[PDB]
Structure formats: C-alpha cells, structure tokens
C-alpha cells in the first residue's frame, strides 16, 4: 500500500524535562543538492500513535518541496486523523539541508477509534523523502520514553510584571538569538551569575536554564555557558555568553556595572505566535551578597525567511585538467566499510535546467551502465572507492555535483569544478 524505503536512517528522540506544548524533530539526513533550482522533493509523513494500548497510524502529505521558494511547509493532506490535523503540523526548513517536523502536543491530531480517551502517546514518527534521482530516503525517530498528550490546559494567562525592554527577539530557523544589556551591582570576581528563560505563547511554555548551574567565577569578558531548554533536544545545543564590559577589581558601592548577556535557546517552535512573550530572569549571588534577582521581558517574533542556504555541506574541489579526459575519484563516505549491502553514487551537472534529462547518472554496487547519462564514465573500482571520468570538455569550466551514500552512512556531497 505505502512505499518501500531505501537507505533508512533511524534516530532516537530523547525529551529533556517535560513537554512545552510542541513536538519538534530535526532530520539532517535528507539530501538538499546545491546549485539546483529544479530539485524538488515529495515528503509523506507517517506517524504511529498508541491510544489505549492499541496501535494507530496517521499518514500526512506535504507535497513537493521547492527549496528556493518556501521555508515553512504546512501539510495539505491527512489520512488518519481528526478534524483538521493540518494546522497542528509544521514542516520547517533549517539551514544546511535540515528539516524540523513540529507538532503541537496540546491538541489531539487523531481520533478514529475511541472518543473520550486521553492516553494518546506518540511512540515513533516516520518521514519519507523523495529524491530527484528517485531515491526513497526515510527517517525513523523513535521515542525513548513515550510521553502522553495533555490537551488544552488553558494557557492564555499571559501576565506582565517584568521590566520591559524595547528590543525584540528574533527566531530564525527555530533558533532564537537575543542580546540583552543589563547592569549588576557586583564586580566580576565576586559574582555567581545565573540566568533563566521562559517563553509563553498561545499554548507553549518553554523554560531554559543553564545546565552548568551558577557561574563559578565571572571572568572579565566573554563568559560562555551551555543552557538547557525544556522540550525535545537538538544538536549544536542552546548557549549563552555573558561578556562583562567592566574592568572591575574592587567595586565601589552603588555603581551598577554594565554586562552584555546574549542568549540562544535552540528548540524554539513557531507555535508561540507573533508578539509572543520571552521572560529572562538573571541574578548574581554569593554569600547572600548583592546582585538581586531581576527580570527583563521582550516580544519574540519569528523570521519567515531561511537564515542560510538550504544547500547541504559541500566540499569544493578544483580539477585543472588538460584536453578532454578529466578524471576525479570519490573517496569513501563517513560511516561505511567494505561490508555494505547497497552503496549509491549519483552525479549531475551544475545548475541543471531539465529534470528528465540531467538526473540519469546513478551507480550502485551491482550496476554501472547509466540509462541516458552521456560522456560520463562511472567505474566502481576496488578499494571501495568510486572513479568519475568526464569526456568531451575544453575551454568550458563545467562543474559536477557528486553525491555518495551507503546503508548506515551519512550522505555526503562534493562539488568538483573542472577548469583550464
């Protein structure tokens, strides 16, 4: 009925703290080819639920993914759910060819079997990815400990008692970045700094604290620290930097020394809505010393544009050939060895203007004769390395985009520029 997967990569989603109100899952595996305005990608999402001890299934459909046209994709189909499950799901594009499936966990997405059961626990989320070459990439994010869904906890109790600042916080590719200048009465060598963040919106309540605890000793300038936010984790975790613009050694009483606190909470979903509230509680301490607890709040808005290029990491390499016999060898991919059941290497000319013409250069372990890829000889030689050989060149700086993948490997992509 459904599709068969090729080169599946499964993840293990681990929730930290509790659920803020959304369900974010990042997928950095799927390939987003560089220098291609004609590279689309169909994506269907299958989600497995557990209502009352009996398994369920929810099929989504996001359609084609135009990389250079739209960032946030809202699903346009639903075959296993409730009344309008297509407003409960967001498919966001981060930088460097990574998506982020977000689902609000305070409103039920499916109800087909029973009506008054609130034991719906999400166990695994599966995402399909249709390649331009026809490859069927898959991802299987499985919950370590599946958390149940508590819906509609009456969240709109927004309140306003915290010193307000005129600056705003921006969230680009789910990543918030704010720079708050503040003043602390203590010096740098006596301050035990500590910060907490809390974002309130329509139904979301995120809480960010620094896992390091209180700052041991505030060194003069650029004090870095990792911060942990409530919800579902992410690589390149949240961070913060308190750079002290104060050459203080023996502080004089009353003088408020200026500090610069820059916060970057990583897992910030879009369901907070525009003009959301972001609280920041900072406080220095010691032997019950100065630096009393303060608070600064500011509006947080979401950037609709992608703050990067969706193209994945690509190693650029030049080939200064002569004549027309230009050759290049593709090394092994990261997580693979000689024992690999299926290995695929694909290539296409830079800036392809046709779909059914340029994407014919595919090579597997049991293949090597491309259907309609001309003047490109692909040989899968020994040493588990591939050998590309381009014929028919000269005085034309053609560029080739090569991409290799294996079973349990991370798909990589090279860019070779044939000059001279």
């Amino acid at each position: 009925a459904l599709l068969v997967c090729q080169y599946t990569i499964q993840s293990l989603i681990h929730l930290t703290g509790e659920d803020p109100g959304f369900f974010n899952v990042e997928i950095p595996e799927f390939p987003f080819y560089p220098t291609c305005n004609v590279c689309t990608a169909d994506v269907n999402v299958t989600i497995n639920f557990d209502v009352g001890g009996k398994k369920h299934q929810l099929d989504l459909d996001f359609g084609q993914l135009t990389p250079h046209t739209k960032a946030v994709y809202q699903p346009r189909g639903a075959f296993g759910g409730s009344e309008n499950a297509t407003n409960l799901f967001l498919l966001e594009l981060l930088g460097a060819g990574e998506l982020a499936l977000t689902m609000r966990s305070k409103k039920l997405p499916i109800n087909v079997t029973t009506g008054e059961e609130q034991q719906v626990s999400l166990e695994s989320v599966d995402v399909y990815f249709q390649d331009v070459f026809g490859t069927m990439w898959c991802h299987h994010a499985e919950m370590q400990n599946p958390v149940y869904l508590i819906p509609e906890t009456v969240p709109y109790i927004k309140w306003d008692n915290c010193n307000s600042t005129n600056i705003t916080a921006v969230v680009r590719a789910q990543g918030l970045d704010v720079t708050l200048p503040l003043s602390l009465p203590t010096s740098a060598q006596d301050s035990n700094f500590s910060v907490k963040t809390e974002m309130l919106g329509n139904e979301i309540d995120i809480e960010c604290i620094m896992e390091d605890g209180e700052i041991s000793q505030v060194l003069p300038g650029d004090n870095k620290f990792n911060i942990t936010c409530s919800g579902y984790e992410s690589h390149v975790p949240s961070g913060g930097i308190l750079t002290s613009t104060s050459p203080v050694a023996t502080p004089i009483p009353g003088t408020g020394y200026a500090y610069s606190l820059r916060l970057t909470p990583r897992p910030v979903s879009r369901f907070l809505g525009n003009n959301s509230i972001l609280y920041v509680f900072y406080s220095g301490n010691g032997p019950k010393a100065s630096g009393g607890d303060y608070c600064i709040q500011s509006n947080i808005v979401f950037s609709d544009e992608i703050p990067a290029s969706q193209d994945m990491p690509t190693n650029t390499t030049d080939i200064t050939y002569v004549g027309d016999n230009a050759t290049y060898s593709v090394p092994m991919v990261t997580s693979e060895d000689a024992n690999s059941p299926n290995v695929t290497v694909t290539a296409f000319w830079a800036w392809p203007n046709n779909t059914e013409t340029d994407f014919k250069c595919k090579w597997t372990l049991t293949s090597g004769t491309p259907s309609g890829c001309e003047n490109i000889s692909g040989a899968f030689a020994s040493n588990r390395t591939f050998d590309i050989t381009v014929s028919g060149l000269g005085t034309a700086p053609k560029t080739l985009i090569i991409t290799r993948t294996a079973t349990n490997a991370t798909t990589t992509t090279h860019k070779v520029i044939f000059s001279k």
Partner: antibody
Amino acid sequence: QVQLVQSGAELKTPGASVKVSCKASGYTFTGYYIHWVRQAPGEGLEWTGWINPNSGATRYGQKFQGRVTLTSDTSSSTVYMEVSNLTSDDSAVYYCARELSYSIRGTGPLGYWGLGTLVTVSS
Amino acid sequence: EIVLTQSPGTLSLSPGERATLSCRASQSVASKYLAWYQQKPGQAPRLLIYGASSRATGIPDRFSGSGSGTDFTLTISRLEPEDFAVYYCQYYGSSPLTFGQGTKVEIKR
C-alpha cells in the same frame, strides 16, 4: 532578603475548607518555584505540590488523588493553597518553600523554607 | 514513582565523631537530583546539600556529601550538641518528589 511569611493556625472541620497565604518577598516572585511540603506527626516529610508563578503551571502529588488546589496571584506576592476534600488523615504542618535557584518545571531543591502552618482536622 | 529508604534511623553517638547517614534509592537516580535537609525540633528544615555533594552556602565543613547510583551518604564528621536535628534525603526532578524517613541524631553528654 527572601521571606516566606506563612499565615494561619487552623482548626478545621471534617469537611475541609482551608486556605494558607504564604506571603513572599525579597526576590522576583515570578521567576522562582514555590513548593509545599507537609509534615504530619508520623515521622516523615511528604511533598504535596508546586506552582510556577509565571505561567500558573501547578503540579500535585499522586498520593492525594487530586485533592489539592494550588493557586497564586502576582499583584500580591502570595501563593494560596487549598486542600479541601473529605480530610481524614490530613492533619499536618504545611510548609511553604522556595527553590534554591531556577529550575526547569519544578526540579530545584528547596533552599528557602517558611515558618510552617499547622492545620488540625477534628470534629 | 520512586521510593527512598533511609537506613540508620537513630545514631546516638558521642560529642564529636563521624556520623555516616545512608540513604538508598530504588531506581538509578541521577547523581545531581538528590538533596539533604536538616530539621531541628520545632523549626523548619534547612537545605544541607543540593547536588548530592554540593553544599549550600552557609553550611559547615563538617557536612560532607557522597553518593552515586543508588547509594548516597552524608557524613557529619565533627559532631557537637548543635546537631541534634533530624536529617532527611530528598529527590527532586521527577514529578513525584520523594523524601526520606529521617534519622534522629542524638548527642552524648
């Protein structure tokens, strides 16, 4: 500077209707978590519940089976507690505490403790 | 839900020596989510140790903390008549916050 001024010395009826104030001062009442730890004369401390004064996020112990109601107003830095049910063995000293520092959804250790409020259920 | 069992219960030691109070957890509790408290008769409790080893500001040096996995112990090294209080071990971080049964320490005279 931290102050948890608990209020009340309550002799309450078998059918419960009780409330304790627990004034708070000396810090940002919004940023810290306030817990309530009951102690009956039975050789033990037991945690009842906590509340976030920023979002109103309240959580209660599972032994109570839903008998507690913990609310808070932010205009006056107080956290009101109600344990109104069919109180059989709920004669204990209810302490109002505040976490040592910030924590993600009520996982800070209690560093600041209140005077304590002794309620006694009897007919 | 997690259960904590405090072994000693009552020490009744001399005025000054190491009192090793133990507290065992049923599950593999995180090495930072355990606490220790001191409640003197009539007063309220006060934080003694917060990160399982971290000592709270103001606490004396005699109060040492140890523990990992499920075996956690607090060592009062130098005893004195001002340590008659009852000490508890707490767990925070999961939804049900768990306390200990307590251990009344008595000073000789």
